[PDB]
Amino acid sequence: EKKYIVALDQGTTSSRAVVMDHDANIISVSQREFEQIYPKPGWVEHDPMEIWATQSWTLVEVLAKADISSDQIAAIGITNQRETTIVWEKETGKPIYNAIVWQCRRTAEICEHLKRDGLEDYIRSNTGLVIDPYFSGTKVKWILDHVEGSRERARRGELLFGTVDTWLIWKMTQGRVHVTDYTNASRTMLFNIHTLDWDDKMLEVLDIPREMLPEVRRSSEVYGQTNIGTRIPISGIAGDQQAALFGQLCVKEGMAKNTYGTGCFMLMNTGEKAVKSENGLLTTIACGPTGEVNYALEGAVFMAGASIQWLRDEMKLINDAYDSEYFATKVQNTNGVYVVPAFTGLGAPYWDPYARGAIFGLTRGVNANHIIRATLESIAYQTRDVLEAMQADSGIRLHALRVDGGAVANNFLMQFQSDILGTRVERPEVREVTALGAAYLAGLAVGFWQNLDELQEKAVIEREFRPGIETTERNYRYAGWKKAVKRAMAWEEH
Amino acid sequence: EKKYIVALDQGTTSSRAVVMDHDANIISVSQREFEQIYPKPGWVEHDPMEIWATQSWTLVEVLAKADISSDQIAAIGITNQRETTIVWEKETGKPIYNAIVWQCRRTAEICEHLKRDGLEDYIRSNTGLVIDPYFSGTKVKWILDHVEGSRERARRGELLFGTVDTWLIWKMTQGRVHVTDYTNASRTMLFNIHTLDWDDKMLEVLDIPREMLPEVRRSSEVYGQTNIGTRIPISGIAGDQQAALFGQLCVKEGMAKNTYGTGCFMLMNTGEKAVKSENGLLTTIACGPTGEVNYALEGAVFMAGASIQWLRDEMKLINDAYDSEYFATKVQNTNGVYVVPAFTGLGAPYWDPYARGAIFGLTRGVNANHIIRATLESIAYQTRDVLEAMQADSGIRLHALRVDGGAVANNFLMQFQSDILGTRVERPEVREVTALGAAYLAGLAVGFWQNLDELQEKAVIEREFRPGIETTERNYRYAGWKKAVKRAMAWEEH
Numbered sequence: 010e011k012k013y014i015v016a017l018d019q020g021t022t023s024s025r026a027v028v029m030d031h032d033a034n035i036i037s038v039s040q041r042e043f044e045q046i047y048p049k050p051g052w053v054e055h056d057p058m059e060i061w062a063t064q065s066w067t068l069v070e071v072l073a074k075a076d077i078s079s080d081q082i083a084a085i086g087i088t089n090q091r092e093t094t095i096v097w098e099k100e101t102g103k104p105i106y107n108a109i110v111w112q113c114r115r116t117a118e119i120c121e122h123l124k125r126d127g128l129e130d131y132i133r134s135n136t137g138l139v140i141d142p143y144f145s146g147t148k149v150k151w152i153l154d155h156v157e158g159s160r161e162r163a164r165r166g167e168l169l170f171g172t173v174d175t176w177l178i179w180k181m182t183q184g185r186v187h188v189t190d191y192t193n194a195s196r197t198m199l200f201n202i203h204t205l206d207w208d209d210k211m212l213e214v215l216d217i218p219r220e221m222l223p224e225v226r227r228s229s230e231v232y233g234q235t236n237i238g239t240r241i242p243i244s245g246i247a248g249d250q251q252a253a254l255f256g257q258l259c260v261k262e263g264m265a266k267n268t269y270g271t272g273c274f275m276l277m278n279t280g281e282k283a284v285k286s287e288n289g290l291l292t293t294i295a296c297g298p299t300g301e302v303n304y305a306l307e308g309a310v311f312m313a314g315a316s317i318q319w320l321r322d323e324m325k326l327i328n329d330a331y332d333s334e335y336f337a338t339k340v341q342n343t344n345g346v347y348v349v350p351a352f353t354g355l356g357a358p359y360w361d362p363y364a365r366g367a368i369f370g371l372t373r374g375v376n377a378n379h380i381i382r383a384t385l386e387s388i389a390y391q392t393r394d395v396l397e398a399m400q401a402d403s404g405i406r407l408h409a410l411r412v413d414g415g416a417v418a419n420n421f422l423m424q425f426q427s428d429i430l431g432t433r434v435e436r437p438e439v440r441e442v443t444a445l446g447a448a449y450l451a452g453l454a455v456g457f458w459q460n461l462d463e464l465q466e467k468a469v470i471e472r473e474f475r476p477g478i479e480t481t482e483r484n485y486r487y488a489g490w491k492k493a494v495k496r497a498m499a500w501e502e503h
Numbered sequence: 504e505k506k507y508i509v510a511l512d513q514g515t516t517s518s519r520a521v522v523m524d525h526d527a528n529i530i531s532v533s534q535r536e537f538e539q540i541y542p543k544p545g546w547v548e549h550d551p552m553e554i555w556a557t558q559s560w561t562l563v564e565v566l567a568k569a570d571i572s573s574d575q576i577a578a579i580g581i582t583n584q585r586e587t588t589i590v591w592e593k594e595t596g597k598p599i600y601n602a603i604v605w606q607c608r609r610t611a612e613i614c615e616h617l618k619r620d621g622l623e624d625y626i627r628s629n630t631g632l633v634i635d636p637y638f639s640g641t642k643v644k645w646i647l648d649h650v651e652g653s654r655e656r657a658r659r660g661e662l663l664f665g666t667v668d669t670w671l672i673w674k675m676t677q678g679r680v681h682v683t684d685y686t687n688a689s690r691t692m693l694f695n696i697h698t699l700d701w702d703d704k705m706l707e708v709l710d711i712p713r714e715m716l717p718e719v720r721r722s723s724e725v726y727g728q729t730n731i732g733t734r735i736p737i738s739g740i741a742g743d744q745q746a747a748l749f750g751q752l753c754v755k756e757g758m759a760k761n762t763y764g765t766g767c768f769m770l771m772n773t774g775e776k777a778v779k780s781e782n783g784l785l786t787t788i789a790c791g792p793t794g795e796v797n798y799a800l801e802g803a804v805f806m807a808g809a810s811i812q813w814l815r816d817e818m819k820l821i822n823d824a825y826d827s828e829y830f831a832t833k834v835q836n837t838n839g840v841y842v843v844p845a846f847t848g849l850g851a852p853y854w855d856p857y858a859r860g861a862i863f864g865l866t867r868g869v870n871a872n873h874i875i876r877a878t879l880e881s882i883a884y885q886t887r888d889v890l891e892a893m894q895a896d897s898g899i900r901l902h903a904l905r906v907d908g909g910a911v912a913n914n915f916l917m918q919f920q921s922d923i924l925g926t927r928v929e930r931p932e933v934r935e936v937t938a939l940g941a942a943y944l945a946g947l948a949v950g951f952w953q954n955l956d957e958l959q960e961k962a963v964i965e966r967e968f969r970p971g972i973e974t975t976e977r978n979y980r981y982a983g984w985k986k987a988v989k990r991a992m993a994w995e996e997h
């Protein structure tokens with residue numbers, strides 16, 4: 010009867026809803042976009058409500074627009090943006106401040122303090138993280154101390170805190186459930202990760218009442234029922250990345266994928282052990298083959314697809330993301346030009362909040378095409394940057410990188426990437442790899458599936474990009490690239 | 504009978520022809536553009552022929568489109584781009600290599616050698632120059648050594664060398680005259696400036712045959728006749744700048760002007776005595792009130808209006824030089840962006856053949872308008888850069904700056920300029936200040952005029968810019984600027 014499953018995707022710039030068949034075919038897609046709030050420079054916010062509305066809209070049209078009824082889909086899977094924080098009035102069921110995006114940089118001050126007070130190591134050690142406005146730890150704080158009663162209510166279990174997922178479930182289940190998963194948990198910077206639980210150190214250090222925290226659960230488990238009707242399950246939950254990692258079926262030690270979207274995230278699975286990055290990465294929680302904790306090596310890159318948007322929206326050198334390849338190919342080379350996409354500081358191995366974007370190597374004969382290209386190239390540089398650490402830590406030579414993400418369509422890109430990595434690059438047949446995950450996770454969590462090895466057929470690499478550039482050629486390039494970076498670091502006067 | 508005088512101006516990006524009456528009015532102007540060759544990044548050449556050619560026509564036009572006849576003009580004045588080197592077959596009358604433009608950085612290697620043979624002082628001392636690809640000595644060489652028999656023929660007077668002027672005159676006078684004036688001579692880096700003659704040291708050091716050199720003469724004298732006819736005369740030569748200094752009538756100690764065009768040349772008259780820079784400036788030859796030798800302190804800025812061209816032709820952020828003002832005033836500020844126009848290295852006071860162009864402090868809210876603005880701004884910075892050296896060296900506080908050049912039409916610029924300086928800026932009434940120059944010289948040379956007080960009434964300042972920014976603001980900006988610069992130097996790998 011119940012022939013399908015639903016993947017709910019709460020993205021950085023929109024909400025999506027996806028439907029699959031048993032053969033995991035994409036039956037249908039829905040998707041509204043929602044407003045980006047830059048209260049001020051470096052600041053990003055969302056309307057927890059807007060976020061919500063969308064996502065629901067999504068949910069339904071899917072439904073209708075394909076003419077499926079609540080009576081035919083197993084469960085629901087769920088994926089979302091990862092650091093972005095929410096806090097709301099419970100009773101009221103209203104947010105007491107707009108969602109603060111992972112993107113947002115307001116929590117810098119704080120970050121600085123912490124730094125002082127010799128905590129890096131507790132953090133790195135117990136959170137697998139690092140000090141940076143990225144993670145919600147400080148986000149949360151920022152709110153607390155910015156709102157009045159706040160800490161009281163909070164303390165008196167009055168105020169609720171969530172992560173996209175968290176916040177979603179709440180609504181699904183009308184206030185009934187206040188849970189989250191591990192992956193997602195991880196991300197907060199208030200969660201011991203070999204302990205699988207909140208961490209008082211932080212909790213108090215950050216000064217947060219355990220009262221508003223939510224039940225941290227497994228990624229592939231049943232969390233509740235949604236009477237979207239005809240009560241529907243919620244059995245899936247991951248960070249879009251882990252999500253996608255899962256969907257790429259990197260579901261066991263040394264498997265990795267690089268994702269090319271608004272940003273860049275390359276996760277590598279560390280199986281059951283959590284490995285410590287000595288080279289500027291993140292230690293984080295993933296999914297093992299059942300929705301079960303696993304560990305992962307993570308490189309996060311703030312600007313990727315976004316620079317492209319920049320290009321199109323603020324410089325207006327292009328009209329389409331699409332356009333970029335045509336122009337890039339319009340020239341033979343970057344003409345010596347280098348573009349450092351540190352619009353938001355650096356991160357990745359760098360983690361330099363004072364970096365600022367920069368263009369280098371200008372010469373009279375350089376033109377917009379050259380600038381465009383350079384831009385794309387930067388994306389690859391970045392990706393190599395981390396690849397290298399990954400290997401550093403990992404102690405593993407990937408011979409093939411499996412990618413995914415919106416921009417994995419830019420073939421130029423794709424091939425440039427292979428060329429500079431000196432590695433083979435695999436472009437999967439399907440692309441909604443993320444949803445994939447949450448949908449798996451979900452129905453795996455419902456015995457809609459009794460294995461990975463069923464959906465293992467969805468994993469069909471469509472395109473293999475082999476390197477075609479000379480090793481020299483290769484390092485040549487990379488050199489200047491770093492030359493650049495150095496020059497862009499520490500711009501911001503602190 | 505003969506009522507007019509013609510100025511011939513061979514510039515970095517275009518040839519020009521200008522006509523004037525006795526009251527020194529601009530009867531008419533002709534003007535054809537010529538291609539800029541960037542054989543390779545940091546390299547710039549011209550087609551001596553295309554020079555020629557385009558310089559040839561303007562003449563005509565100007566004539567013919569005002570219906571003047573060869574019979575009504577006295578002489579002909581000559582101003583040209585100052586360092587650009589040409590070498591050509593004589594019998595044959597053809598270049599044996601494209602013009603190497605002053606901008607061109609190909610001769611840095613060489614330059615490096617010279618540096619390590621401890622010749623800076625001799626240079627500095629006898630030339631008033633500095634070791635840098637700017638000046639021709641090395642250009643010449645570069646050619647020699649890059650062409651086959653070259654030094655023989657050269658050696659057997661087979662080959663001929665000259666600067667633009669030298670090259671024009673040659674053409675003018677079908678092969679009749681091979682001279683140049685001092686100004687222009689100075690610039691070669693092969694002429695002692697206290698001896699007023701070639702200098703063997705140099706000559707041999709660089710291994711140039713005294714054979715292809717040209718008679719060095721006075722700026723205002725009768726060199727020959729042009730049968731453009733109806734034999735017309737040539738009684739005037741000057742490097743463009745020198746020429747505009749005269750036109751500005753800065754004709755005695757402490758008179759300075761800053762010119763704004765393809766580049767930025769700020770000169771200041773040092774009378775009969777040659778002052779020695781200690782602050783990265785140039786000691787060179789100028790015109791005394793009678794077209795007699797004088798000395799000057801010179802600051803050379805490679806990129807200026809040129810970065811605007813860039814914006815418009817390569818980046819295409821605008822359709823008109825014009826447009827720049829509008830867009831810039833479209834924003835309140837450069838939003839932290841800093842642009843370092845080092846497309847052809849740095850130059851005064853820096854003299855960094857390895858610096859390359861750079862954009863800085865990018866941030867996602869940055870737009871094309873900010874870029875635009877930044878660029879202009881960078882022009883004023885640079886200017887400040889030198890102005891202080893100027894004083895550093897001069898030991899003189901200018902209380903006003905007299906400018907001129909294409910770009911002084913840019914009021915925003917102009918204003919911004921006076922703000923960052925902390926000084927009033929004077930925009931004279933007449934703008935063909937250069938042609939003015941050449942004409943005078945040329946005509947002054949022929950009893951077409953018999954005193955610089957005559958023409959003296961043209962110096963009417965039309966607009967005066969006074970600073971509207973606070974002293975702080977001022978240094979605050981400058982600071983970033985310098986910060987910016989630092990980061991752009993030594994890009995190029997040597």
Ligand SMILES: Nc1ncnc2c1ncn2[C@@H]1O[C@H](COP(=O)(O)OP(=O)(O)C[As](=O)(O)O)[C@@H](O)[C@H]1O
Binds near residue numbers: 020269316414416418
């Ligand atoms: N073709 C091409 N080329 C290049 N580039 C490109 C393209 N397309 C697109 N692109 C890009 O991509 C991106 C998008 O894609 P994606 O969705 O996948 O990502 P995400 O992260 O998910 C965001 As959400 O989370 O906020 O939604 C963006 O950023 C753009 O820009």
Ligand SMILES: Nc1ncnc2c1ncn2[C@@H]1O[C@H](COP(=O)(O)OP(=O)(O)C[As](=O)(O)O)[C@@H](O)[C@H]1O
Binds near residue numbers: 808911912
């Ligand atoms: N408005 C405005 N704004 C800005 N800018 C401008 C304008 N107009 C113009 N401009 C500019 O300026 C310049 C012109 O002016 P001049 O003619 O004087 O220059 P030379 O010296 O001649 C070089 As050639 O000799 O090579 O031509 C050029 O470069 C442009 O860009």
Ligand SMILES: [Mg+2]
Binds near residue numbers: 743
């Ligand atoms: Mg000129």
